[PDB]
Symmetry: D2
């Protein structure tokens, strides 16, 4: 698991469950092409997005469908989605956790890169 | 205005208005002496807490009454308050806070 | 001033000065049309991006060039940029962002 | 494990390792009395702070010694520590995770309350 995504709900203080997540990789023509996707589990985590063989160096976009999460709960959101864009780098053994903390009109995201 | 507070509401996408803020200073007997207090304005800002003369060196605690804010809004909060503790020795301090019911962030802007 | 951006630096405790910001609007062909751009001032604020006439309904993307900011500071950043995507239909939007090398937050203040 | 604390470093994108954490509970005279403490592990997590029998309803303060963390790394910090203050409530099965995301001049904290 070189790339895991964790999503939290700052209104209810809970994992954000069943949130769609799309990962894209930048192509040579600088377009976004689909790379992996899934939905967060009961724990707010999305594992198994990709493999080490597939997850080569490049520019990646993680798109979290926050609007659909909030609208299902009957809470009015501002953003279309949360977007996390980064270049991956093979510098020793590394696993990327992309955490997102969601509020209706705000989000924060952090990358935890561990050996 | 050596110490200013600005508070935003991450649920409503608005300034957090009429938020109570209390500032304490650590006294010689290691107790928290009341130093200043006020409420955020319609812009979410709290000016005029103190003066350059009054704002001496020391350890300060800024307590932002987030619980009463969420309760007035009709929302269940987790935290009792947001606390910001720092040492002063940097002329102007702005303590910014962003509030959600189960999360907050605070940043110091020192100019 | 219907769309404003404010950026803070969580490492230095300062406004994030001279940060490039680009605004795009989703076009009829589902491409991102350049809409407006500018740089944050010494206060970390970016005013004058657009006008009420120009800022029509639509889907907007605000891209804040965080990578170049950290690189100019001499710090290794994780993100390419901070992206904020929203639909407009609410008169004044302030997009606030708080930057760290491996984390950022963004909040919308709609007044 | 009814109370776990997780601390992350937003400058290096890593767990914040070996950070001292002190937990206090509010006494009847409204003083803070020591309740539990520890240091974060290699993963930035602190487990085993307390037991369900000990962790009764009340007002708790979690004090994270952020200043000592930053000073050891040679990065100048603003805060003395990060303080997280909350009332615990027994409403069904519950575990509290107190997460803190640290930067030299900023921190965020979130509570994740799971069944």
């Amino acid at each position: 698991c070189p790339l895991m995504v964790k999503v939290l709900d700052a209104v209810r203080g809970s994992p954000a469950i069943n949130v769609a997540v799309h990962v894209f990789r930048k192509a040579a023509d600088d377009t976004w092409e689909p790379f992996a996707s899934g939905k967060t589990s009961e724990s707010g985590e999305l594992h198994g997005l990709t493999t080490e063989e597939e997850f080569v160096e490049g520019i990646y976009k993680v798109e979290i469908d926050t609007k659909s999460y909030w609208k299902a709960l009957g809470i009015s959101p501002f953003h279309e989605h949360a977007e996390v864009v980064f270049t991956s780098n093979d510098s020793g053994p590394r696993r990327y956790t992309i955490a997102a903390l969601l509020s209706p009109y705000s989000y924060s995201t952090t990358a935890v890169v561990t050996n």
